Design a protein around this ligand. Structure first.
Ligand SMILES: C[C@H](C(=O)N1CCC[C@H](C(N)=O)C1)c1cn(C)nc1C(F)(F)F
Ligand SMILES: [Zn+2]
Length: 140
């Protein structure tokens, strides 16, 4: 579990969005596994606006932050799960690292701010949904 809190927005994995998130919806994209809801209070996370490929992510299944190298956001085939059929997930970045069901929502960060959140796992790889292209999170 986990979310990004920026301005008047809450960014979560779409597959883990609560009833309250859908009742206060701003934007959602199944192909990226992202959902953004509105908040009453202002958030303080800063979204990275960069092309970094090295960062640190939080892994709840190990209670540890790990430094990683990760790929550029791409359309990657993801195996069928209880949440989606087998499909290409867009804007996804992979790194060599531990992930397991329960780790989605963990933040990946670089020197510039938040890069994205854990969204996939398997075969000793961890996948992060990028948020650096959502420039609108920094406004209105
Ligand atoms: C099966 C699950 C996963 O990748 N997904 C389930 C949830 C929906 C995902 C998607 N975005 O499409 C695919 C997974 C397997 N490992 C080892 N770690 C995970 C994870 F970290 F929980 F994501
Ligand atoms: Zn960066």
């Amino acid at each position: 579990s986990g979310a990004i809190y920026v301005g008047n927005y809450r960014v979560v994995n779409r597959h883990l969005a609560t009833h309250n998130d859908w009742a206060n919806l701003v934007w959602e994209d199944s192909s990226r596994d992202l959902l953004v809801s509105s908040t009453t209070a202002q958030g303080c996370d800063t979204i990275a606006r960069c092309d970094c490929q090295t960062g640190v992510y939080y892994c709840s299944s190990r209670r540890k932050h790990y430094p990683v190298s990760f790929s550029k956001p791409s359309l990657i085939f993801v195996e069928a799960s209880e949440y989606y059929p087998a499909r290409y997930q867009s804007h996804l970045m992979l790194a060599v690292g531990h992930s397991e069901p329960g780790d989605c929502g963990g933040i990946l960060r670089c020197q510039h701010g938040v890069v994205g959140i854990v969204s996939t796992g398997g075969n000793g790889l961890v996948g992060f949904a990028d948020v650096r292209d959502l420039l609108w999170l920094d406004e209105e």
